[PDB]
Amino acid sequence: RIIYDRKFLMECRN
Amino acid sequence: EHYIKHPLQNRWALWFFKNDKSKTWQANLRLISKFDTVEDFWALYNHIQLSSNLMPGCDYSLFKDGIEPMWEDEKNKRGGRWLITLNKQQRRSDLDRFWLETLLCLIGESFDDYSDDVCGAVVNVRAKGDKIAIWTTECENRDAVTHIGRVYKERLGLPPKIVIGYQSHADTATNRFVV
Ligand SMILES: C[n+]1cn([C@@H]2O[C@H](COP(=O)(O)OP(=O)(O)O)[C@@H](O)[C@H]2O)c2nc(N)[nH]c(=O)c21
Incomplete structure (x- = not known):
């Protein structure tokens, strides 16, 4: 399963 | 595979509803x-108009690919959702805030294996007040519904007791849990 952190998701906008 | 972009657990579909008066509710999705x-995800979110700018009677819906944002879908008929209520005065300061967080819980599979029960989320802008909810597949799955609700309320940052409820789509069409 592919899980992503609130923080990591935010980092991905860059 | 080679990570130039980061894969999501599910493919998601964003829907728009326009409170039309000459088509069946289902045809307006x-x-x-x-x-x-x-x-x-970020390219779409950053481009389209924010929820707070939706004209009254319109909605946004984010659902797993293949699940239509409606009660009749096989994945929603026996389900229901966790509802977040907002008066119109919170539109420019809280709605977008709560919506984005909701969207992040979904694509990020934030409820462990219980994310499989998640079907999608809906935000409704109405002159009388706005609504945001997360739809789950079975209102009978106590452990999954419960877990989903706990994390979600924590993720929203809602005070110790705003008390949010979960109702089955069947009832709404004619609270089974609170947090
Ligand atoms: C979410 N939803 C809403 N409606 C119809 O839309 C009306 C509006 O309900 P709403 O948009 O969910 O909230 P609102 O009453 O504050 O505007 C409902 O009373 C139904 O007539 C729906 N009608 C069908 N058939 N299926 C749905 O999933 C569905």
Whole structure:
């Protein structure tokens, strides 16, 4: 399963 | 595979509803786009108009690919949702805030294995007040519904007791839990 952190998701906008 | 973009557990579809008066409610559901990576998510979110700018009677819906944002879908008929209520005065300061967080819980599979029960989320802008909810597949799955609700309320940052409820789509069509 592919899980992503609130923080990591935010980092991905860059 | 090679991570140039970061894959998502599910492909998601964003829907738009326009309170039309000459089509069946079901025929007015309009699809915006679909995506399956984090970067594509941000390009869509950053481009389209924010929820707070939706005219009254319109909605936004984010659902797993293949599940239509409606009660009749096989994945929603026996389900229900966790509802967040907002008066109209909170539109420019809280709605977008709560919506984005909701969207992040979904694409990020934030409820462990219980994310499989998640079907999608809906935000409604109405002159009388706005609504945001997360739809789950079975209002009979106590452990999954419960877990989903706990995390979600924590993720929203809602005070110790705003008390949010979960109702089955069947009832709404004619609270089974609170947090
Ligand atoms: C979410 N939803 C809403 N409606 C119809 O839309 C009306 C509006 O309900 P609403 O848009 O969910 O909230 P609102 O009453 O504050 O505007 C409902 O009373 C139904 O007539 C729906 N009608 C069908 N058939 N299926 C749905 O999933 C569905």
